[PDB]
Nucleic acid binder design. Structure first.
Lengths: 136, 386, 65
RNA sequence: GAACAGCCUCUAGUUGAUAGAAUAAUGUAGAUAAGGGAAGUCGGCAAAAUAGAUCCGUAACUUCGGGAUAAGGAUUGGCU
RNA sequence: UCUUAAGGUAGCCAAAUGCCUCGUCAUCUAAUUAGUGACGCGCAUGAAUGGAUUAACGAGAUUCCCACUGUCCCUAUCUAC
RNA sequence: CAGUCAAGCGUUCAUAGCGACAUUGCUUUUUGAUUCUUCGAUGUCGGCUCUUCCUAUCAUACCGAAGCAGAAUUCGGUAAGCGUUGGAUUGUUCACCCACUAAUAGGGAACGUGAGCUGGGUUUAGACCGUCGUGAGACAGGUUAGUUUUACCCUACUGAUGAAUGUUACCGCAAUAGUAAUUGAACUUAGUACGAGAGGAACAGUUCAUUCGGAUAAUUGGUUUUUGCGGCUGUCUGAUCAGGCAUUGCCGCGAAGCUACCAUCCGCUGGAUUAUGGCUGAACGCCUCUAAGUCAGAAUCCAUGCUAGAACGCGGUGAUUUC
């Protein structure tokens, strides 16, 4: 996302195209995040912009407290649930897709993470790592 | 009118016609540029693609966010018994190109190479190079004169080599014969090297070395006739499509009133000559010892061959090379390893690679053990073990 | 490198081979292959699956080790 | 089995449809598919999901007759 | 005041009927020429050329939601002919 | 769409950027005008798919000019090499919003493309409404339902054989044809250059990543007629054991093969140039990048590479038929 993105990430297998609804892993009052676009996505005809672990996306709250609903916010994917390959050859996956609301810089609206967070996402976003309990 | 939305074309226009290769063995199209200062040396080698396996190695990339950590990589193991050089041909430069002036063979020719020269070998008189050896079989009868011709002419010198199909576990019995350029010393030095190396084996540990970028030249795996969707990657037509959806919808405009060469059409897929470049040698090993798959960290006595042998291939009791990644062609196929046409640093070609562990588990399923000793230790005693 | 123990079948997992699963409880489950993964996701008990190391230990099988 | 449902069998009848050769592309018919879940498309078109039976529970509205199998949930084998 | 025979009453409406028009406001969405609710100087609604409403019913015509899925991202594989 | 002149606008400072009055053109992506071809039929809108071409260049390469300070920007040159997206609404071309992006540039190819698809709309017959008609009926007014046929011929294209330079075999050459890679981010440079301060760049570097392409199946995931193993229902084989049948009976694993940016690997460096900036140097005793000569220089071109190998283009080499 520019200033807030601390480093680069290796290629993580995409598992969240546009229209995907993931759980909301922070305590901002939102329950799910619906992905409307992915930052840094490429342009291919008919190809859906797909999010991966640690990616920043544009999201809308479909279920949650009304103040977050009916508007677009940045979000960061913290769990993918779609198997991706790390550098050490391990194919790992989570139980569910999950993300956290954040500002365009990268600062979360919430102060804690409910559940585990991927190591790639934690390395990309230090504040997500700071508010995350378990990093895998 | 214009396309409503732009999109890149499907497929590469520099790789057609997508036709079958002229031969099973893929020749080196261009040899590396000649240098006279360097010693005479083979610029290529002929191996047989044994299979694929997995390695573990510490990545040394000074600046990567995940540097000095263990990584898992896929490597290709090719069985490379030492190629027998016999014969040498000369090429004079003409306003028409390199023209072959003469080829001089050696005294004894192997049965496998004569089988290569033959088609119905079993129902034959085996009359091949007999009168050639009669012209030969003396000290200075008529072969030294041809050598002098190649020295006085033939600005390019290419030695002739054949593989050890008998040493390899193939059921072919027919040697593969090719030319390898000598890119060192003068023409006299090249011819002297070829004559001294006449009728004998050259080892790939002498040709190539560890931590080297080379090119694999091979014919890809054949897949027969194929439709456009998998041959070129075009879109699948919608479900409600009359008379077929695995097709290209529009194959041309009204004008020009012809199907154009650039339109994707169904046809042969695979079995194409290909030259892939920048493959890093992860190991050059020999089969005249155990612990071929053993490293300084694993130090477990085991050969490269997985449990039950390489699937569809067998055992690698010869000399072998494990290069990084995949190479064109499938198992049991002859591949030509050529020295790189250029010298690049890139902080990736000079990276010294030290292997930690090589996957030797069975590739014939989800293999759990790497050695029969380890398998027996884990499982204990069985009913069949007395 | 290091080898592992399958969270279901109790088998050394070599690098590259197998898969890893992270439950909602943030518990790591390493599976040697799709067979063990599928059994775990079907929620079959390793102590009742006959070929598992847990089964052998529970049934006192192969005590010669 | 609720059942002249579907499935297997007894009596009776037939074994009739040009054949042979491990089958390439594209088809016709039947099917699976990781993650997402209509982002496809004029449109959820076609497929999928649901489904029997026994219990629990069942809203607005209503012409009080319905809605209603509303919606939702739980069990179902074998043996003694 | 002109004016007809009377000058559209009760109702309803951008309705399958509204040209302008993708009417205006609200809601539904991140975004809606769609949908619903509301407003009517209604080109050109309207009372057995029946008006308005309506439970139940409909292989009728639109909108949204849950579930579900190869419709799609993005295709792959299998069988029979 | 583009020129010419310059009254003016640009805080005094016509043409940095615009520019009235006027005037000169170009363009066949608009709509008119015409009726030349077609009424013993050239299948009619839109979308999907796919290829190529144009440049009047949105982005990317290198530059020139600013009311260019830096950072964004604006004008222009070479330049079509390479890209130009995902969606809500609408049958929609066109639109208008949400976003992403380097950008979301404009067009042609019988208003490209229906024996390629679809049939949402127009565009038969059924039906409803409003207005108009006494009526039958009319309405580029609204609404609903409404058969989309044929390739096996020729050519074109995609692949595949193949007679005939004595035969046969091996190893090659390379004319010609094609060609490919592309874009961004982060760390350092650097809170530096610049700036009153706010703000705030380029790197020769290093790591990744969109987009495209060629392969490959070590691993992971997918597929199951391995009908391989096991389990289950109904029925039949007297019971067991073992099986048959149920369009492959159903379920769980399931090797091998195939396959996925759903997996992995790989995708080269030299010369000549355009714009432009220069050297020497006149025409024109000075000046001048130009007249002669000449230096550097673009994602450009041509080669190095890569694909095919002329089936009427070739070379070398082995053997070449006792009754």
């Amino acid at each position: 996302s520019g200033n807030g993105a601390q480093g680069t990430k290796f290629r993580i297998s995409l598992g969240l195209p546009v229209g995907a609804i993931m759980n909301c892993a922070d305590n901002s009052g939102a329950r799910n995040l619906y992905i409307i676009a992915v930052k840094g996505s490429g342009s291919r005809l008919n190809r859906l912009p797909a999010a991966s672990l640690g990616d920043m996306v544009m999201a809308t709250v479909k279920k949650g407290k009304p103040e977050l609903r009916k508007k677009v916010m940045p979000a960061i994917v913290v769990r993918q649930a779609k198997s991706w390959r790390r550098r050490d050859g391990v194919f790992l996956y989570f139980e569910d897709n999950a993300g956290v609301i954040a500002n365009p810089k990268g600062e979360m609206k919430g102060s804690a993470i409910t559940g585990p967070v991927g190591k790639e996402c934690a390395d990309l976003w230090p504040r997500v790592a700071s508010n995350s309990g378990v990093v895998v | 009118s214009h396309r409503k939305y732009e999109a890149p074309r499907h497929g590469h226009l520099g790789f057609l016609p997508r036709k079958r290769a002229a031969s099973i063995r893929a020749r080196v199209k261009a040899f590396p540029k000649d240098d006279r200062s360097k010693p005479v040396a083979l610029t290529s080698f002929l191996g047989y693609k044994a299979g694929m396996t997995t390695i573990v190695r510490d990545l040394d990339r000074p600046g990567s966010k995940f540097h000095k950590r263990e990584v898992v990589e896929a490597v290709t193991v090719v069985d490379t018994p030492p190629v027998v050089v016999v014969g040498v041909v000369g090429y004079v430069e003409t306003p028409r190109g390199l023209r072959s002036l003469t080829t001089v063979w050696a005294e004894h020719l192997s049965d496998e190479v004569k089988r290569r020269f033959y088609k119905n070998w079993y129902k034959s008189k085996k009359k091949a190079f007999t009168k050639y050896s009669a012209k030969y079989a003396q000290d200075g009868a008529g072969i030294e004169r041809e050598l002098a011709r190649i020295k006085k002419y033939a600005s390019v010198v290419r030695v002739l080599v054949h593989t050890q199909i008998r040493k390899t576990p193939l059921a072919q019995k027919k040697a593969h014969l090719a030319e390898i350029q000598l890119n060192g010393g003068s023409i006299s030095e090249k011819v002297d090297w070829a004559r001294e190396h006449f009728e004998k084996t050259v080892a790939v540990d002498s040709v190539f070395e560890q931590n080297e970028m080379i090119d694999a030249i091979a014919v890809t795996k054949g897949h027969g006739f194929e439709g456009v969707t998998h041959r070129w990657g075009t879109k699948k037509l919608p479900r409600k499509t009359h008379r077929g959806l695995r097709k290209v919808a529009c194959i041309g405009a009204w004008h020009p009133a012809h199907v154009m060469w650039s339109v994707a059409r169904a046809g042969q897929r695979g079995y194409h000559s290909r030259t892939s470049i920048n493959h890093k040698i992860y190991r050059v090993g020999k089969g005249d010892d155990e612990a071929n798959g053993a490293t300084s960290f694993d130090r477990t006595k085991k050969t490269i061959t997985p449990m039950g042998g390489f699937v569809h291939y067998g055992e690698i009791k010869n000399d072998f090379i494990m290069v990084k990644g995949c190479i064109p062609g499938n198992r049991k196929r002859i591949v030509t390893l050529r020295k790189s046409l250029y010298t690049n640093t890139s902080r990736k070609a000079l990276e010294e690679v030290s292997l930690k562990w090589i996957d030797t588990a069975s590739k014939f399923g989800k293999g759990r053990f790497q050695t029969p000793a380890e398998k027996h230790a884990f499982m204990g005693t069985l009913k069949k073990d007395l | 490198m290091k080898v592992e123990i399958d969270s279901f079948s109790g088998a050394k997992i070599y690098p590259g081979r197998g898969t890893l699963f992270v439950r909602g409880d943030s518990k790591i489950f390493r599976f040697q292959n799709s067979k063990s993964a599928s059994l775990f996701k079907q929620r079959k008990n390793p102590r009742r699956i006959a070929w598992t190391v847990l089964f052998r230990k529970h049934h006192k099988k192969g005590i010669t080790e």
